[PDB]
Ligand binder design. Structure first.
Ligand code: CHL
Ligand code: CLA
Ligand code: CLA
Ligand code: CLA
Ligand code: CLA
Ligand code: CLA
Ligand code: CLA
Ligand SMILES: CC(/C=C/C=C(C)/C=C/[C@@]12O[C@]1(C)C[C@@H](O)CC2(C)C)=C\C=C\C=C(C)\C=C\C=C(C)\C=C\[C@@]12O[C@]1(C)C[C@@H](O)CC2(C)C
Ligand SMILES: CC(/C=C/C=C(C)/C=C/[C@@]12O[C@]1(C)C[C@@H](O)CC2(C)C)=C\C=C\C=C(C)\C=C\C=C(C)\C=C\[C@@]12O[C@]1(C)C[C@@H](O)CC2(C)C
Ligand SMILES: CC1=C[C@H](O)CC(C)(C)[C@H]1/C=C/C(C)=C/C=C/C(C)=C/C=C/C=C(C)/C=C/C=C(C)/C=C/C1=C(C)C[C@H](O)CC1(C)C
Ligand SMILES: CC1=C(/C=C/C(C)=C/C=C/C(C)=C/C=C/C=C(C)/C=C/C=C(C)/C=C/C2=C(C)CCCC2(C)C)C(C)(C)CCC1
Lengths: 225, 218, 81, 205, 213
């Protein structure tokens, strides 16, 4: 129950201290996927709540069995975390410098072809940073490091913690998970921000396919300023 | 807890032998090395421990700050001066001392103002360190905690001990590195990165023996 | 004008004042400062949706102080620089 | 037992072998829900049938064009040729004609046997029982497919789906190789028969 | 034994046992998950077995060209055969990618069967294939299998002879692995083949140390 605890409780909790952080997001009181027009039928009788970020939106007959539901929850969480990382990493280099510094290539969907250029990939356009020029070496390092990471994920489980919420000392240095109630509220926040990032990534793909870049079409067009 | 126990790896490795009577563990970075026999007195031991930890933290900061500008300049960052033992002369240069070479940053031009500000601020903070001030009160001379550990990384006493060992080890390494920096800067006359680059190519003659003949009398 | 220095200074001043208001880094309606500047707790009969106790009165006060500080800083910087 | 795709590994629990050609190949677990298997087998049947048709139409006319007895143009440029009717009009005509077939298919997969009666003359019908297998005179002219199967039907079904999968791979191969190489499949075949090592994926780029 | 003292984690019972494990990776506190009692010796002996062929073939073309019974076009440096195309290339009937795909497919088949046998001892002894189940019998431990085709010579009649042979094999593997590591170090420093390095210390005993560059 570290110093970060009771600090999140006073400030970062999304509900008043008298009210618990359960009811607005769990149980029969969930906002549901059609707002005030949801009607009892559109909520499946097995999507009863009791899990983070469900709005009773199963239009196709997916889930309906606990194993499928739990699995799909796990891939949703993983895609969401990776999408948060992807969106923030796609928007950071363009924000820091939108100019085409030869070794930089700020555009997110054009940095792949930067490795084949003579200038290579120069982190922050600094000539002495990495300065990679070989795609095969990057391939090999990706394969080795991510194979080790995922093998540790799906084989080196402590056999006592959740596969996707390990917690513990190493994954929760600040000890946010001291209280189960705030833990569930934080899980709800994580799921919702992850879904927002996933839609941001999909829209980024589509708008890169149609229009040029991210800053332009947000400052060049649709926000004439 | 191999380090804190009565059996610890010591500074000779597995083949250590004699261990000082007082050094029973109970302290971070205890390797049983008291050949000089200076900390026999308990209060002297506490004072030397305080000196060690303060020196370790100062030397970690010093090593980081002596390496980073040189690495940036080598990598392609513009500086008025990048050598660690030459960076003080920028205050006497016409262009002045600008952070990261940017005239819009700090843009300090006088040495007296810097000296006065440093004296006042460091006097205040050291007085706080000795007697307690705005950021808390004195509980342990070396490990105050509280406002200086806001994220609470040392709440668990076992993790606290492990972090103590980590910090003292990194700090002693940094202290040794700073002594190396001083002697190499006074012997060779070039920055640590220049010495490393020299050792990278033809290491046979890029060493101390190359300059071993520069201090012969006569 | 949106990217101008004046706009940045004003938005930064207002945002920092609001941040120091919502989190207990400055006095507010529910957090009184003593003669020693200690920020003791004070109970006011004002209901707010913010779980930390930040009210609309605090919003107005912090925004006003932020606009004031920002205007002062902008004018001083224009006069000196 | 049955010959698995991967020897020495347990097959997925949801594949009992009853379905034709069950090789126990579900690495990604996309058939964990029993009700999904029926839709997936229907979809794979439809793609495999249309893929066998497409493979025949992309290979036999081109092979006979190579033989010289036929003058069939390259299938990649078939849609850009001039025809006596508007291609978009042809599209809407085939759409309208096939809408009835698609409605029949949807109705029978949702509810088997509900479209098994001829509307105009109710006497005419189809003899099929399994979902997606109508039999009858219209769809089974030779009466093949209604037989007491101790070992009869299953082998035919298995070789049917095997040929379907092979044709699926073949048609995507043809599309990909025409995209990669601006030449017909027969040109690539002749190149690989002349010198397989010299002509390959790396040969073009 | 073994210079630094042992900690009784190993008593010398294992084939090719010497005790030179100063860190003790099989320490149960430091062992788990990927670390398996069967897996580490198997991996060591396989890295050594492939080091045999690597050390032999890193010099076989050059020594054969030296003695004078191989085509001189095969005297290419071992790193110029196509292992690292940027350094160089050697003539072939097909592209290096094609032979690479061929060898990867064949090694995939072989490695897959071996890994199945390691995981399940009945692999290729009770599986489904064109009569090779009875020709790939799983005998003894997976690391030292033998079989109807593996034991064609029939050598190794006595268990004392078996242990003697196996300790010889592990010693040869260790020396080969050190030799091959020296091969990469010489290749990255001098840029030439190890056989030429032999030619140099034979010709000039005081030729050079490290690289002096
Ligand atoms: C994980 C998602 C991921 C996605 C969606 C993409 C998608 C893309 N990559 Mg890419 N990559 C991705 C991960 C990776 N790429 C690469 C290595 C490359 C290269 C070398 C190139 C791309 C290019 C591209 C772009 C054009 C695609 C194309 O050539 O047709 C497109 C934005 C190309 C490009 O940027 O052209 C505009 C290009 O040359 N990628 C690596 C290293 C293994 C990745 C690691 O995961
Ligand atoms: C999944 C996450 C992810 C991935 C794959 C990448 C991938 C990449 N980033 Mg990146 N980045 C990320 C997250 C990610 N980033 C985040 C979260 C941030 C914010 C701190 C950044 C901030 C960042 C900067 C500031 C720069 C990169 C750059 C790069 C490119 C070369 C750097 C490298 O070693 O790789 C590469 C395409 C460099 C580049 O040239 O990109 C155009 C570069 O200068 N990244
Ligand atoms: C004990 C800690 C310590 C001390 C005394 C200094 C002292 C100094 N640093 Mg410094 N630095 C440090 C740690 C330290 N550094 C660390 C840890 C980093 C990495 C984050 C840096 C990164 C850094 C940069 C990037 C720059 C300095 C610069 C400077 C000089 C100008 C001081 C100023 O205006 O600010 C001064 C000699 C400036 C300079 O001119 O350096 C030559 C400058 O541009 N420092
Ligand atoms: C960044 C600083 C900051 C500032 C200036 C505010 C300011 C405000 N918040 Mg708020 N909030 C913040 C951070 C902040 N919050 C954070 C970090 C959280 C997450 C825990 C919340 C969660 C939150 C909720 C849940 C609600 C507010 C509400 C309000 C408004 C109360 C007005 C009133 O008296 O209602 C009378 C006020 C404008 C309330 C409101 O009415 O918003 C429109 C409300 O219901 N806030
Ligand atoms: C970046 C910070 C900054 C800087 C550089 C300045 C700079 C300046 N301010 Mg200013 N100011 C600031 C912040 C700042 N201010 C803030 C935060 C406030 C509060 C809103 C004010 C409120 C303020 C007022 C009310 C006045 C100034 C005035 C001045 C000018 C100096 C006149 C003076 O001292 O005569 C010396 C005066 C005596 C010795 C008496 C000078 C240009 C004065 C001005 O504009 O005069 C032309 C003036 O009247 N300032
Ligand atoms: C007047 C309104 C109306 C409309 C919009 C439709 C529309 C449709 N009917 Mg339909 N139908 C209607 C009246 C109507 N029907 C009447 C009055 C009868 C007589 C009882 C039928 C009997 C009928 C049969 C028997 C079938 C359709 C089918 C269909 C669908 C395929 C035709 C198409 O173009 O697509 C289509 C959704 C077909 C379908 O999809 O069924 C699954 C089909 O097989 N209809
Ligand atoms: C290719 C990598 C590799 C791998 C995986 C191993 C693995 C192993 N070696 Mg080994 N070894 C290697 C290369 C390797 N060796 C090389 C290149 C040498 C030459 C110096 C040695 C010399 C060596 C000795 C002398 C001993 C081991 C021993 C061991 C075993 C105990 C070490 C442990 O706990 O882990 C373990 C099976 C010890 C043992 O008893 O193994 C049975 C032992 O005494 N090794
Ligand atoms: C190959 C294919 C799909 C492949 C899918 C695979 C591998 C899926 C594999 C798995 O999912 C399983 C099974 C089980 C899971 O647990 C695991 C995975 C591994 C995920 C589709 C083919 C589908 C193939 C089809 C439908 C072929 C169509 C042919 C056409 C369109 C012909 C067109 C033309 O007539 C025109 C229009 C006019 C002129 O151009 C002339 C021509 C060219 C003749
Ligand atoms: C497999 C291997 C070499 C294989 C080479 C091959 C196949 C080469 C093939 C080819 O080159 C040819 C022939 C020529 C061309 O055709 C190209 C290719 C195709 C490229 C080397 C292994 C090499 C393996 C090595 C070097 C292993 C070293 C291990 C050490 C030092 C371990 C030490 C300790 O573990 C102990 C023992 C005890 C612990 O307590 C403490 C520590 C200190 C951790
Ligand atoms: C709910 C529901 C229900 C009912 O059933 C109905 C329905 C409809 C069915 C459903 C829905 C669904 C959905 C919507 C989904 C979606 C998804 C997504 C979007 C994903 C993404 C996803 C996404 C993702 C992962 C992403 C990722 C990313 C990344 C990594 C990136 C990276 C990068 C970077 C940084 C930078 C550089 O320069 C480039 C790169 C390299 C590229
Ligand atoms: C609801 C919401 C929220 C919020 C939001 C926002 C966005 C807020 C803001 C707010 C604000 C942002 C406010 C502001 C205010 C301001 C003000 C209030 C100002 C005033 C000014 C003044 C008062 C000035 C005056 C003057 C001076 C002094 C100088 C001279 C001139 C004059 C006279 C004019 C939250 C997060 C909670 C949640 C979500 C939603």
């Amino acid at each position: 129950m570290t110093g970060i605890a009771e600090w999140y409780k006073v400030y970062g909790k999304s509900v008043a201290p008298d009210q618990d952080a359960r009811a607005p997001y769990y149980g029969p009181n969930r906002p549901l996927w059609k707002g005030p027009f949801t009607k009892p039928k559109d909520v499946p009788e097995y999507l009863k709540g009791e899990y983070p970020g469900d709005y009773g939106c199963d239009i196709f007959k997916l889930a309906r069995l606990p194993a499928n539901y739990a699995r799909l929850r796990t891939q949703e969480l993983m895609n969401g975390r990776w999408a948060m990382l992807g969106i923030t990493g796609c928007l950071t280099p363009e924000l820091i410098n939108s100019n085409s510094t030869p070794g930089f290539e700020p555009v997110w969907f054009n940095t792949g072809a930067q490795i084949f250029s003579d200038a290579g990939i120069d982190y922050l356009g600094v000539p002495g940073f990495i300065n990679a020029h070989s795609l095969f070496a990057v391939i090999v390092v990706q394969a080795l490091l991510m194979g080790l990471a995922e093998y540790a994920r799906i084989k080196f489980v402590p056999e006592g913690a959740d596969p996707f919420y390990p917690g513990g000392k190493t994954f929760d240095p600040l000890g946010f998970s001291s209280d189960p109630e705030i833990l569930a509220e934080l899980k709800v926040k994580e799921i919702k921000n992850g879904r927002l990032a996933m839609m941001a990534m999909a829209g980024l793909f589509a708008q890169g396919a149609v229009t040029g870049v991210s800053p332009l079409q947000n400052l060049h067009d649709w926000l004439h300023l | 807890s191999i380090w804190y126990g009565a059996d610890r790896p010591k500074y000779l490795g597995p083949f250590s032998g004699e261990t000082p009577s007082y050094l029973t563990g109970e302290f971070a970075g205890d390797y049983g090395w008291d050949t000089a026999g200076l900390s026999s007195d308990p209060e002297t031991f506490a004072r030397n421990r305080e000196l060690e930890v303060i020196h370790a933290r100062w030397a970690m900061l010093g090593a980081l700050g002596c390496l980073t500008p040189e690495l940036l300049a080598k990598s392609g960052v513009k500086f008025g001066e990048a050598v660690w033992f030459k960076a003080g002369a920028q205050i006497f240069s016409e262009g002045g001392l600008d952070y990261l070479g940017n005239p819009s940053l700090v843009h300090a031009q006088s040495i007296l103002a810097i000296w006065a500000s440093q004296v006042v601020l460091m006097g205040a903070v050291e007085g706080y360190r000795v007697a307690g001030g705005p950021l808390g009160e004195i509980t342990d001379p070396i490990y105050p905690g509280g406002s200086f550990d806001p994220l609470g990384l040392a709440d668990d006493p076992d993790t606290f001990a492990e972090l103590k060992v980590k910090e003292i080890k990194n700090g002693r390494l940094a202290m040794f590195s700073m002594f190396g920096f001083f002697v190499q800067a006074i012997v060779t006359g070039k920055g640590p990165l220049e010495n490393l680059n020299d050792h990278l190519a033809d290491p046979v003659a890029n060493n101390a023996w190359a300059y071993a003949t520069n201090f012969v009398p006569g | 004008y949106i990217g101008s220095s004046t706009n940045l200074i004003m938005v930064a001043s207002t945002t920092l004042m609001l941040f120091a208001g919502r989190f207990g880094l400055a006095p507010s309606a529910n957090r009184k400062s003593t003669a020693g500047l200690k920020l003791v707790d004070r109970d006011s009969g004002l209901q707010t949706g913010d779980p930390a106790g930040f009210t609309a009165t605090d919003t107005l006060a912090c925004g006003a102080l932020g606009h004031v500080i920002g205007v002062g800083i902008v004018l001083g910087l224009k006069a000196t620089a | 037992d049955r010959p698995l795709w991967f020897p020495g590994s347990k097959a997925p629990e949801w594949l009992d072998g009853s379905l034709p050609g069950d090789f126990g190949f579900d690495p990604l677990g996309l058939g964990s829900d029993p009700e999904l298997l029926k839709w997936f087998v229907q979809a794979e049947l439809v793609h495999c049938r249309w893929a066998m048709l497409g493979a025949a139409g992309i290979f036999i006319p081109e092979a006979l064009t190579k033989a010289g007895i036929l003058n069939t143009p390259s299938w990649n440029v078939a849609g850009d040729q001039q025809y006596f009717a508007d291609p978009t009009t042809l599209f809407v005509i085939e759409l309208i004609l096939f809408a009835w077939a698609e409605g029949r298919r949807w109705a029978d997969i949702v509810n088997p046997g509900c479209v098994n009666v001829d509307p105009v003359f109710p006497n005419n019908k189809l003899t099929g029982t399994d979902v997606g297998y109508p039999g009858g005179l219209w769809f089974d002219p030779l009466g093949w497919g209604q037989t007491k199967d101790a070992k009869k039907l299953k082998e035919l079904r298995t070789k049917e789906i095997k040929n379907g999968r092979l044709a699926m791979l073949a048609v995507l191969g043809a599309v990909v190789q025409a995209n990669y190489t601006h030449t017909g499949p027969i040109d690539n075949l002749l190149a690989h028969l002349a010198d397989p090592g010299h002509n390959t994926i790396f040969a073009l780029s | 034994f073994a210079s630094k003292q042992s900690l009784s984690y190993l008593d010398g019972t294992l084939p090719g046992d010497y005790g030179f494990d100063p860190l003790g990776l099989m320490d149960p506190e430091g062992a788990g998950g990927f670390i398996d009692p069967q897996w580490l010796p198997y991996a060591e002996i396989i890295n050594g077995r492939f080091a045999m062929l690597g050390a032999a073939g890193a010099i076989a073309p050059e020594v054969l060209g030296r003695i004078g019974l191989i085509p001189q076009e095969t005297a290419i440096p071992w790193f110029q055969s196509g292992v690292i195309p940027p350094v160089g290339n050697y003539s072939y009937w097909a592209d290096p990618y094609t032979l690479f795909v061929l060898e990867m497919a064949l090694m995939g088949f072989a490695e897959h069967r071996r890994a199945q046998d390691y995981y399940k001892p009945g692999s290729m002894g009770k599986q489904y294939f064109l009569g090779l189940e009875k020709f790939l019998g799983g005998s003894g431990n997976p690391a030292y299998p033998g079989g109807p085709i593996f034991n064609f010579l029939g050598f190794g009649k006595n268990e004392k002879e078996l242990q003697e042979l196996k300790v010889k094999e592990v010693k040869n593997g260790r020396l080969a692995m050190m030799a091959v590591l020296g091969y990469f170090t010489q290749a990255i420093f001098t840029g030439v083949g190890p056989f030429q390095n032999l030619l140099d210390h034979l010709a000039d005993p005081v030729h050079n140390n490290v690289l002096t560059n």
